[PDB]
Design a protein around this nucleic acid. Sequence first.
RNA 1: GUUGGGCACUCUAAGGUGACUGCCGGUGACAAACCGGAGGAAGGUGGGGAUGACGUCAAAUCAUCAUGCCCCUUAUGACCUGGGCUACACACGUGCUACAAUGGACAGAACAAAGGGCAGCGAAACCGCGAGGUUAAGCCAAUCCCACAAAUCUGUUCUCAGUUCGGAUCGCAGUCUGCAACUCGACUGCGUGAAGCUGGAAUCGCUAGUAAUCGCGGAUCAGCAUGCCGCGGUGAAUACGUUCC
Lengths: 78, 60, 149, 95, 125, 206, 108
Amino acid sequence: SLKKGPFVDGHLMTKIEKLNETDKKQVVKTWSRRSTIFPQFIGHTIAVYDGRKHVPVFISEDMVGHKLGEFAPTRTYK
Amino acid sequence: AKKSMIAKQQRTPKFKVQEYTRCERCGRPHSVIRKFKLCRICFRELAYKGQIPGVKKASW
Amino acid sequence: KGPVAKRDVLPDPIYNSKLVSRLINKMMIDGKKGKSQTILYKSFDIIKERTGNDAMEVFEQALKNIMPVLEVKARRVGGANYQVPVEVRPERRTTLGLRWLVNYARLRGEKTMEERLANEILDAANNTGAAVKKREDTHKMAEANKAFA
Amino acid sequence: IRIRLKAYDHRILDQSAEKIVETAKRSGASVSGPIPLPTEKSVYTILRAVHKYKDSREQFEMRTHKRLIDIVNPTPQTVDALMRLDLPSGVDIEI
Amino acid sequence: QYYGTGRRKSSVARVRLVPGEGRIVVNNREISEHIPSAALIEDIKQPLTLTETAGTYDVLVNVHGGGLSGQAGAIRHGIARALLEADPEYRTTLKRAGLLTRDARMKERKKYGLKGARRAPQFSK
Amino acid sequence: GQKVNPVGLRIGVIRDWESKWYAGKDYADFLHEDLKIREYISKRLSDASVSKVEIERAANRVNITIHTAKPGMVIGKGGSEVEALRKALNSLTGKRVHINILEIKRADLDAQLVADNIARQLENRVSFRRAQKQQIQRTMRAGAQGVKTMVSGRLGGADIARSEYYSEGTVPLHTLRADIDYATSEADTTYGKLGVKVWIYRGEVL
Amino acid sequence: RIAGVDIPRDKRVVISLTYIFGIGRTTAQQVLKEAGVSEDTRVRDLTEEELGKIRDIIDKLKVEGDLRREVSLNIKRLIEIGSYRGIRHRRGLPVRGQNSKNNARTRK
RNA sequence: GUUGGGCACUCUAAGGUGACUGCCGGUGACAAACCGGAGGAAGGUGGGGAUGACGUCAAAUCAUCAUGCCCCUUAUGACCUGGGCUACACACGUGCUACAAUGGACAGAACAAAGGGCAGCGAAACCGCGAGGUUAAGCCAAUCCCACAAAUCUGUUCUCAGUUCGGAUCGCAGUCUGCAACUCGACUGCGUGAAGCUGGAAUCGCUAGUAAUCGCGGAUCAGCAUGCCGCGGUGAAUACGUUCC
């Protein structure tokens, strides 16, 4: 991902822009972990699928340059 | 799972990168040679049975 | 089975000796005769410079000091672990001399193996030196175990 | 008119080489001879065993060798002779 | 122009001995311009030193293949062959020196299950 | 870990290719078309006892030669056999198919038909000594300098399966000018799967 | 000394400048071209002109405590926000995605 | 070598010839064979490969395949996304890189083999520090490309230190492939720079173009190689011997 742009899925972009056209709501259950965080996501609590559950994460100013799956480890260890 | 997996490979998937090479005679991936479109063990069998018009035993 | 033998190349463009090319094939690391030839000729040019002599005769004198008469082989009978002294046949005298030159030269430590080989030849000429410790000690091991022959 | 035969057997390609050589030589086309060109061969190494034994292999060999034929004088009698040469599937004429 | 081919270790040299004074010309370059490490220069000159050929032929060499010691072997083999074609006399001298052998020591083919055509990988029990 | 198959060992020395053409641009596709051909034709004529199929590829045309050891089961009444044989091949391949059927005189020297003849008798519940010895007498009278028939599997004996050699004459698998027919066949019986391996040293070429 | 930390007097300039936290070899060669010391001098042998140009060029560059404090800020940032890569920063398990049943022995 | 020209030469690939203890001498029974010699490119199965006897381990493979029997069946079968097979306190096989002056860095000069390329190989030019990028020649290939070989050799430089050794780890910035590189890709650029100064008991490989070392290639494959499979480059040391394992 170099100069083509950042990446997001179109469905998650659709859900977030429906959320952003009026105001925030409940969590978004989203299996996409592959997608970067645009600055327009900030404040939207979204539920990333780790493999077996939907973990809710609240997006801040810092949590932008990374992706969604950085905030859900998939492997439980001790 | 053999005829299902063979059928799934014989399809066109959603993406070209989901496409992988497969047997064409004895259903398995892992070591399908691109030239013969054949699995490794089936290549040894058919190349022993006088088919596959190029290959004989190698020595140099 | 039976014994098999090997060969070696006669000249060196300066210092025309068999055994100096035998030392060239020795101390060769990783298949580089070029580096060992460079080390050898720069070392013998130091031996020609630092002592105003031809380095052939100094090199043979160093060999003569190092070439061991008596190896001490092994012979374990029962629980005894005896070492038995062997009159060395002179091919192995030259090759043990070259191994001891090369090994104790690179074991010495100076600012090139040019200098280490030069100073090890200069020490083995006037017999007291580092490889000649091994010469003396092998003759001492043969002297102690002389009861078996 | 640069006919490059390439085959798997040397004897079949020799037979199909000198057949074109003679049929073009008889009608005056000044046949430069069968220039033997380097073979492209490929080696396919294969685990013999069904399941284990990476150390146990077998090597197979596919050689395709090619020879070049040139026809220099026009002599279209030779072209009509080449069009009716029926030589087998082993050799792959490509003019 | 006596001509001789020399082969050594996947290298082939073409040595033509022209009647001259002793210049050796390797691919329109001279000796140390193309072969350093003068042990190869004395080994490449040995057929010309055993029989007296010291300044009676210039040498022109067209070499291809191998490496620099392989090219040295190919040049000295071509020298001995063209220098037999010069005079048939001293073939006993060249043959006692080697020089009509073409050392057939090709690099061996790597075998499967081995690292390097003799090397076993490592044994553990 | 044992013997290389002698068929695959003598390919490109004396024994020819069965599949004879040259690769243009769809070598894999020609191969697997010919695998479909050989499957279809060996299934259909496993009644009519066809051993081997040699396929040509002749610039949109395929010449299939068939070694059967009987003509009039496979060329038959003339019309019906060539109809049902060339017509379905023209369909399931997609281009022209010509069929030339060479007949094997001495039906007992081709190891494919011999191994099938031993396999059928095991499926006909004939004892596994009678099959191999009867067939060895048939082959050694049909004229062969050596025959070896080896049958393995559950021979009608449950909890131990073993290999059985019968042979007569020289079968020299190490002489690389030998001209040996090797052939396997399988026999699915009520007790499991039997494996017949027959190979027939027929004579060498100087 | 130059960035509040020493450089060795008896080395050449290109490699005495390497010991400053923030300058390796290639930024040192980018400096000494701009300064014009021609890369072949000791730093025990310079002039106050020739070393003052080195000083204020390095003063323009992000070198001494800036680098450590900002890289600690980046590490603390992705430790505090969550961020599995910072979990690897914390625990002593490798960050860039590396197998851990074997070595991983820079980190524990 | 571009052109005209030539098949001499290399090379290529077909048919040959050729090495058989054949000839000499010696030994031994005169045999079989053995030791040396001459010739010869080749000397005693010339080097290698392929070839793996009857059988042994109820060895391995029901997961390449085919399978007898037993089990499941709106599920022990099938689709879809996400994860995992990359976990990590530990042990343990195989490997790679080093610990350094026969070295490191910087500049110049040369020498290879073998193999791959059609929706693929991709020149040259341009831009970018670089990974690479844009336009595009040629190539279904002894032509054109991959492909600028590397150790090497020759100058400059450091001077024996945890360093001008080593590159781990890591932050930042990039590039390419691909719906998508977060777990989980390779590579580049800047910076950080660790353990390590030749390894206890024990232990492995190799008898010659071999070991050691250096690069190149190809399968697999969009992309991923330190693995494997081949190729060349330089290129050794030793074998008294069968006392011991």
